[PDB]
Amino acid sequence: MQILFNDQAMQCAAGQTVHELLEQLDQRQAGAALAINQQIVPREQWAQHIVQDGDQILLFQVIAGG
Numbered sequence: 001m002q003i004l005f006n007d008q009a010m011q012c013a014a015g016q017t018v019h020e021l022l023e024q025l026d027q028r029q030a031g032a033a034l035a036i037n038q039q040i041v042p043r044e045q046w047a048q049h050i051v052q053d054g055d056q057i058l059l060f061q062v063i064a065g066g
Contacts, residue, residue, distance in 0.1 A: 001053030014053035018046030021055060033060035 001014025005025060012024045018036070022028060029043055035058030041049055043063070 001051070001055065003051060003055030003057055005057045006059040010055075012051070012055070014051065014055075016051050018049045018051060018057075020047075021051040021057070022046060031062040033063055034058050035060070 001012055001016075003010045003012055003021060005021075005027075010025065012021055016024055018034065018041070022032075022034075029046070033040065033043055034046070035041070036049070036051070037056050038058075040058065040060075
């Protein structure tokens with residue numbers, strides 16, 4: 001499978017959530033949000049957000065709004 005992490009193309013485990021994608025890529029969170037396929041999902045879902053071959057991702061630093 002392949003993905004786009006912050007405009008960076010990649011190849012990881014298709015079907016693996018984000019918590020699965022990030023962790024597979026060797027990335028965790030520490031306060032990070034991301035947008036896949038242009039849909040910004042809340043970190044928590046990363047653990048149940050199964051990623052698919054062609055997984056596109058956006059990277060946000062810290063959860064800050066306002």
